[PDB]
Design a protein around this ligand. Structure first.
Ligand SMILES: CON(C)C(=O)N1N=C(c2cc(F)ccc2F)S[C@@]1(CCCN)c1ccccc1
Ligand SMILES: CON(C)C(=O)N1N=C(c2cc(F)ccc2F)S[C@@]1(CCCN)c1ccccc1
Ligand SMILES: Nc1ncnc2c1ncn2[C@@H]1O[C@H](COP(=O)(O)OP(=O)(O)O)[C@@H](O)[C@H]1O
Ligand SMILES: Nc1ncnc2c1ncn2[C@@H]1O[C@H](COP(=O)(O)OP(=O)(O)O)[C@@H](O)[C@H]1O
Ligand SMILES: [Mg+2]
Ligand SMILES: [Mg+2]
Lengths: 320, 323
């Protein structure tokens, strides 16, 4: 199964970006001043334009993937793109101003909170007893951080090792798995993460745009007609305008090596590609959401992102 | 009137305690050893079990009563990073969305203050407007953290006000109007969000910056005889930078000023930094001033807790002459 690549465009806070969902097409005014007429076009698996509310993203991109998680496959969603184009928005979201909605209902919620709420809804009183545990593992300067561990300072780095059993596997020493016992335990658990993020931003320069975040949901399920185990990793990558950059560089070379069928794929050259090894060229169903800004001020980065997302279409995975 | 100096001690985390606070004796005492200790006396002393409403009732309500009479006032939060300065002046949310913002027991001074201004001034005769500014000092550069237009990183300039002489004018600093109690939280949300950018753009912004949150209240009384009496009250809520920290110039200049004021030297170095120049009248001037020292109960912070208590204790001897 080829990696699916979705493009989403944010609204202005004179677009050079035109989206055609039905044609699955993105169009860019490249010539600006002299050449009003030239455009670049790329085709992707799906295309969402600037009026795409969150529920459109959740219904089309996530629900299908999460259903597959509920079967007991692995799945990953990456958000890729230039800083300020909506990666954190898409994977996490925001709160409607002035305490208008509860977190379960807020139309501005994104993938992570929308998922943890519906994991419980999809699986309650339908036979299956199940456990939900989450991890927030984050990479900065090729150093590993736990951002939901409650008895640790964020600044305590983790260690990573080869898993002897697996060969793509890594073991992270002391990565905390927090259990989510019910739907109304989520937001509380997300708030503890929110606060260490703030501490992390205080400890590390440009932490929010220079760090990679892997938010992982593990579901053990019991339905004797049978035990399934599905894992969904929610990856907020660092802005694609970037040791400080090593994971972002190596994600690049892995994707290249994979599609040009190059011999030695360098998963081991960076912690991000070691953790997410099975997501690039493995037994994981992987989706990439490329995010882009509609303003001519960002022409070169928008084009950089589209070229990157498009060359990633050709990676074959084998969800097993 | 001597400046009021209170010490508040935070509780531990989920991650030995060398701090014993005695409210009734208003004494905080710290184990220098472990047969050893140092003791200080303060105007008030709050222990790790002190709820926020106790801080607000004890420390702020008089201050605010005085603001409404038409005086200026400042409340400083001093202490080393991780002891509760931002806890004290802004607060936190009770977990799991349990209370609305107006009712949350974990709200701190600023949100509680903006709530009760409207409460205290409902139907009491006085007509009034509330405007707020969030001005911040970082690396001796000025920042507006509530201007809805303009990016955070757009720096402001400051000048001597020719009219006043302690005065400065800050060019392009925005005053946002709070028309009622239910416009507050929303306005703070814009603040909360520009803060997140600021931390992204500037190294350790949350601990190396000074934050001046100012509420000005224009008041109009009209007597039994028709005449209008106009009072103007201003409250500055100052979250100072961590006392363990050019990048340090305001924090360093505050120290020299406080020293200079308490050993009564003629030359106070107000204009050696933007913080002491902005807040010039709060140190040795006609402003009623309170300092809240924050300290940690852990032996691991022994050296800084002392440095803080010693710092706070010397500010007791600053005399102000309000209005
Ligand atoms: C109010 O405080 N909190 C905790 C939040 O607002 N959120 N929790 C999130 C979150 C935090 C993390 F640390 C890690 C991964 C995450 F998904 S998502 C987010 C949005 C904030 C992100 N900018 C949210 C939750 C629920 C509904 C709508 C938005
Ligand atoms: C995102 O939600 N918001 C906006 C908040 O939670 N708060 N607004 C704060 C705030 C932000 C500023 F930029 C400046 C001065 C301030 F006081 S106070 C605080 C929480 C403190 C840390 N933010 C709060 C509000 C209401 C009840 C209880 C606590
Ligand atoms: N699809 C969208 N709809 C509304 N606002 C958006 C959208 N995408 C991004 N934004 C806004 O743009 C700003 C940048 O979003 P952010 O998620 O921080 O980008 P990134 O994570 O790539 O740095 C935020 O204020 C966010 O509200
Ligand atoms: N009085 C208090 N009660 C409860 N928690 C506190 C208190 N003071 C500090 N904390 C906690 O300690 C940490 C440091 O708080 P903070 O105000 O950010 O410190 P500072 O701004 O002085 O560096 C936060 O987790 C906060 O919740
Ligand atoms: Mg982001
Ligand atoms: Mg702080």
């Amino acid at each position: 199964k080829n990696i699916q690549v979705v493009v989403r465009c944010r609204p202005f806070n004179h677009s050079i970006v035109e989206c055609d969902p039905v044609r699955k097409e993105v169009s860019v005014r490249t010539g600006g001043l002299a050449d009003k007429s030239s455009r670049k076009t790329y085709t992707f698996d799906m295309v969402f334009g600037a009026s795409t509310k969150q529920i459109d993203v959740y219904r089309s991109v996530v629900c299908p993937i999460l259903d597959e998680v509920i079967m007991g496959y692995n799945c990953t969603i990456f958000a890729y793109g230039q800083t300020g184009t909506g990666k954190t928005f898409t994977m996490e979201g925001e709160r409607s101003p002035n305490e208008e909605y509860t977190w379960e209902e807020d139309p501005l919620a994104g993938i992570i909170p929308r998922t943890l709420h519906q994991i419980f809804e999809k699986l309650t009183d339908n036979g299956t007893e199940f456990s939900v545990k989450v991890s927030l593992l984050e990479i900065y300067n090729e150093e590993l951080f736990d951002l939901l561990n409650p008895s640790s300072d964020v600044s305590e780095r983790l260690q990573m090792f080869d898993d002897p059993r697996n060969k793509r596997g890594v073991i992270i020493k002391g990565l905390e798995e927090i259990t989510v016992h019910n739907k109304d335990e989520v937001y509380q658990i997300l708030e503890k993460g929110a606060a260490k993020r703030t501490t992390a931003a205080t400890l590390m320069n440009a932490y929010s745009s220079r760090s990679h975040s892997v938010f992982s949901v593990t579901i053990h399920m019991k339905e004797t007609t049978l035990v399934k185990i599905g894992k969904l990793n929610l990856v907020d990558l660092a802005g694609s305008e970037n040791n400080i950059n090593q994971s972002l560089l190596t994600l690049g070379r892995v994707i290249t090596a994979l599609v040009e069928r190059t011999p030695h794929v360098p998963y081991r050259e960076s912690k991000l590609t070691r953790i997410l090894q099975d997501s690039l060229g493995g037994r994981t169903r992987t989706s990439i959401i490329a995010t882009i800004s509609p303003a001519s001020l960002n022409l070169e980065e928008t084009l950089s992102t589209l070229e990157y997302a498009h060359r990633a279409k050709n990676i074959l995975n084998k969800p097993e």
